[PDB]
Amino acid sequence: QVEHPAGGYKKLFETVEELSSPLTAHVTGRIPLWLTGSLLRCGPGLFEVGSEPFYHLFDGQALLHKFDFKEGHVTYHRRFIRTDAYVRAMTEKRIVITEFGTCAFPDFRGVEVTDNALVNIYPVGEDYYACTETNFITKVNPETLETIKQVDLCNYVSVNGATAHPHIENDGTVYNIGNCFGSIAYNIVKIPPLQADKEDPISKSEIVVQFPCSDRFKPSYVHSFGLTPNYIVFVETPVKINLFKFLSGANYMDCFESNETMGVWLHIADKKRKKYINNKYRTSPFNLFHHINTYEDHEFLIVDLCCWKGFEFVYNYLYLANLRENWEEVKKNARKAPQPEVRRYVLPLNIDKADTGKNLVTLPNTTATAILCSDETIWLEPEVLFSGPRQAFEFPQINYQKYGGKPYTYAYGLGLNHFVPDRLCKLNVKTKETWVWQEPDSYPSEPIFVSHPDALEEDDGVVLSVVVSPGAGQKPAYLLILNAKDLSEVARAEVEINIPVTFHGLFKKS
Amino acid sequence: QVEHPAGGYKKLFETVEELSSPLTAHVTGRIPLWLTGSLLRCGPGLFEVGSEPFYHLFDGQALLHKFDFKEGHVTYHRRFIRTDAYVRAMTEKRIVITEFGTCAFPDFRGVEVTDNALVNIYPVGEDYYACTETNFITKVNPETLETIKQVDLCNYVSVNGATAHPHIENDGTVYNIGNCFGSIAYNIVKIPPLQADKEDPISKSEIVVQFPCSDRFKPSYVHSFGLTPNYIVFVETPVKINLFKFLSGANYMDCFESNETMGVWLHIADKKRKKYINNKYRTSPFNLFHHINTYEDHEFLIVDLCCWKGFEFVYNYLYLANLRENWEEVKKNARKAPQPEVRRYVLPLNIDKADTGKNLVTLPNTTATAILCSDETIWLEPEVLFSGPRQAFEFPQINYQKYGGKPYTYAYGLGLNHFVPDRLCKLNVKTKETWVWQEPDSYPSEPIFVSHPDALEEDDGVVLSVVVSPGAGQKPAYLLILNAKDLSEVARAEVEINIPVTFHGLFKKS
Ligand SMILES: NCC[C@@H](O)c1cccc(OCC2CCCCC2)c1
Ligand SMILES: NCC[C@@H](O)c1cccc(OCC2CCCCC2)c1
Ligand SMILES: CCCCCCCCCCCCCCCC(=O)O
Numbered sequence A, B: 001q002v003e004h005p006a007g008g009y010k011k012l013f014e015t016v017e018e019l020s021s022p023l024t025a026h027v028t029g030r031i032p033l034w035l036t037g038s039l040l041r042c043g044p045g046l047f048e049v050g051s052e053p054f055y056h057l058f059d060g061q062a063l064l065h066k067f068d069f070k071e072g073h074v075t076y077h078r079r080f081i082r083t084d085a086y087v088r089a090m091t092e093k094r095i096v097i098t099e100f101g102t103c104a105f106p107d108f109r110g111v112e113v114t115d116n117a118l119v120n121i122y123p124v125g126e127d128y129y130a131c132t133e134t135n136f137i138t139k140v141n142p143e144t145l146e147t148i149k150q151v152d153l154c155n156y157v158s159v160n161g162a163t164a165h166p167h168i169e170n171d172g173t174v175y176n177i178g179n180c181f182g183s184i185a186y187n188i189v190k191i192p193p194l195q196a197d198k199e200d201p202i203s204k205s206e207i208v209v210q211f212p213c214s215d216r217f218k219p220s221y222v223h224s225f226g227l228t229p230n231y232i233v234f235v236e237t238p239v240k241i242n243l244f245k246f247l248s249g250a251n252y253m254d255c256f257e258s259n260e261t262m263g264v265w266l267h268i269a270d271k272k273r274k275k276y277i278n279n280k281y282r283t284s285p286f287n288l289f290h291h292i293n294t295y296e297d298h299e300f301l302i303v304d305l306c307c308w309k310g311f312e313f314v315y316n317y318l319y320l321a322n323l324r325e326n327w328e329e330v331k332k333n334a335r336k337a338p339q340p341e342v343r344r345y346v347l348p349l350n351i352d353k354a355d356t357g358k359n360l361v362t363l364p365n366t367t368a369t370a371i372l373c374s375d376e377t378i379w380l381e382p383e384v385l386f387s388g389p390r391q392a393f394e395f396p397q398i399n400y401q402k403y404g405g406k407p408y409t410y411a412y413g414l415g416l417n418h419f420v421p422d423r424l425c426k427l428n429v430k431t432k433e434t435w436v437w438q439e440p441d442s443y444p445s446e447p448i449f450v451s452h453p454d455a456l457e458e459d460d461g462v463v464l465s466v467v468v469s470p471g472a473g474q475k476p477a478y479l480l481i482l483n484a485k486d487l488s489e490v491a492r493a494e495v496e497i498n499i500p501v502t503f504h505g506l507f508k509k510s
């Protein structure tokens, strides 16, 4: 459908320099007065060290970005995060730490796991942490973008790592998941809010509940998980980490393999009684990176997911050399890739043996099914919410503070065209209506939703996305502000420098 | 969504009497001049013999119906088909032959298989045959509706039975499928067109190709199949016929069971070289009654299906006592039923071992996938074309003569609301747009498409459906003629008597 023959998307993967202090952006249209605060995003900003290239999308050195709405103007600022990976590279003028898809070559100390925090940033107590998916997170300063310290979660709780998508309750309580040793297992970690003593909430971390693993020695790759007021949902996919190959030229990609026969196993745990529920939910194979939202509806959990159909690891398609190709080749490279699809799964909670052989999903407004089998597995089929050929609705966001974990209607997403980000999408998950914002030669980022302080409806607010527009007669980038009702444009804050790709972030209200 | 508290649909399952000669219908609107010919449909018309009830939807005695467009008026006529089942019942004043869900009680001869031809009618040579799904078909007179003879396909070819959905090529060549003995197997039967000798084409029947069965002694129930210019497609579902229980109080329903672990196996055969292709296509469990259309697109077959998600046999929900309940109870009874969904499957024909682990479906306009596994199974996921909660798009029809087996855009269907027929639907299978015709307290039949003789586009024509409208100030039934472009009404031909449910039929042009 939409084509990008000029190859502008290449700019998303080009090195930039940090700034000494904030630039003032030039605003077009009108920024609502109520929008005061800061958009903070992370992504790779350095794609080679001298003449040594990084190879994968997830290898570039973490760059922390900020758009600040204050005092009737908008500023843009970015700084590299002073991780061990980045600081040692700058010192030694080479790739020192092995990244996801780039092995470092040398030139007793133990394996040096990357702390390249390029993926997301989130609050813990009164602090902010940039993260990747390892055991290392980096405390950063949200005002100045200075790097404060490295933290090793292994010093506090028993997990080997943790996702870049913790869930955060309204009181500031933080939940995350990581694999551990139990036999392998997956641990839900909880960090309480800041208390009166003002001591670091991370030092009060604990394990809430443990999920079993389908394979004794091979945990699945986990990228996110679901949380409602009463339940925790974990989706175990057939993308496996081969721990044998892990602990014996290698990078992180080399240790992944796909299990061809397991499909997807879905798991739930009682959040409040802190216990695993032994219901054997089963379905077809897909990769999963992002949960959209999860909620409870009578005796059922509604589990909305951004899926990639198949068991081949989608990250195989995300080496930089492939994302930098010309457009005809980008399309051709995605021909045999897993197909993206938004799916709603419905998990019955009150399972009666007398209904063996039947569909347990008795809700009136879904076509999802769940069949109780005689072996006691529950075989799920989804209701499809969005499906376009090689057109993914990904990097999903909702009105999180008020609708996270609850019944809801709207999701916002980044549209990927053969893996190239080229549109912003709003989905009504009940009616499947969509709204799209797109301009030619414009490559946007994850949309972040900000609620109007006096909102009455779920979509009373704006959506923020950072857009790269390399075209000949163009400011090379801008912050885009859309009305969430219909994705119509409200304002842009343009800047005169490039901005590389970013993955995730937050809006910090002020 | 739409509700039927008055329970008018009960009239669909009420006995009627045959007519001595045609009634003249009263026409409202205007019937196109080009529409000349006859609509012939079959269904049950006698739901009890004296005080002995029939229990299942498929048990009532075959009634042959005709709407005749001739000479600037429309007539309606119906006659019971004088099958052995019907004639013996009328003679003995009781249920003599066991029907699908009604065991006959007595009052050396061999098992007496029903020849109650209530399901469909189709041409063979210059003849027309009413059928069910047994070995017995009944030659009928399309002008007078007289019954001519019983035919036993077992006298001509080696099958135990045959579906009520043969495919008919433009030259009159007839293809069908039935299970047989090979070990059980499934045989494609071919009947040639009428030749110069004028001898009965059925006496020239032969077996073209044989499909293997997933279970040595248990064939799956088969209701229809797919045909393109070069391929035959057969879908083997987990609804099994237990031949053990078959050959040992019993009716046909009692012999069915669901296989919980096989899912669906899809099979193709080279039509012209008459050989089975050994590609092991596999997917999730569903019931299938009706193929919509099948065609070839580069090295792929496109297989569009009306599916019911799950392995429980959907016919369990179609006993007359359940279909006659009040509306709140009808809905409640369908709560745990399989969910209807229209699905497009895509079958790769050129399978390369070097693509093991990847999605082979490289077509640009689909989200269907097919993954080649190391065990050499090919795991399919569908593109969903239509999905509504307990709202089935069923009894599908297309512009068959010109688009059957070929690339196409439009399907027409009967909308079932918790198994109650209450709307007519047109689907664009490429865009997924739909059009609906619905009126309150009106229960339509399968829509049959008739092409304009000077058609330029696929949907240049009309759709015919027989509608029952029992409401207080109403002619109790009518033939509905809709414009196929948008399902807007063109004319009705009303009659002053009831018409019970009909399943399938044809338009015979004249
Ligand atoms: N968000 C994309 C993946 C990226 O954050 C990344 C970059 C570097 C290392 C890494 O490791 C994930 C590992 C978790 C522990 C087990 C091996 C895989 C993951
Ligand atoms: N169209 C609905 C089913 C109906 O035609 C019907 C009515 C009566 C008998 C029957 O038999 C199907 C059998 C095929 C041979 C093996 C057993 C099932 C099927
Ligand atoms: C942000 C656009 C990047 C261009 C490549 C987009 C392809 C993403 C495919 C889905 C995988 C999502 C994993 C990345 C998000 C994360 O690291 O948390």
Ligand SMILES: CCCCCCCCCCCCCCCC(=O)O
Residues within 6 Å of the ligand: B119, B164, B289, B314, B318, B394, B416, B419, B420, B421, B445, B446, B501, B502, B503, B504
């Ligand atoms: C025609 C409306 C009948 C009312 C019940 C409709 C439920 C049909 C469920 C799908 C099964 C289709 C099988 C019947 C068609 C046939 O016998 O060929």
Ligand SMILES: [Fe+2]
Residues within 6 Å of the ligand: A164, A165, A223, A289, A290, A504
């Ligand atoms: Fe992510």
Ligand SMILES: [Fe+2]
Residues within 6 Å of the ligand: B164, B165, B223, B289, B290, B504
């Ligand atoms: Fe049928």
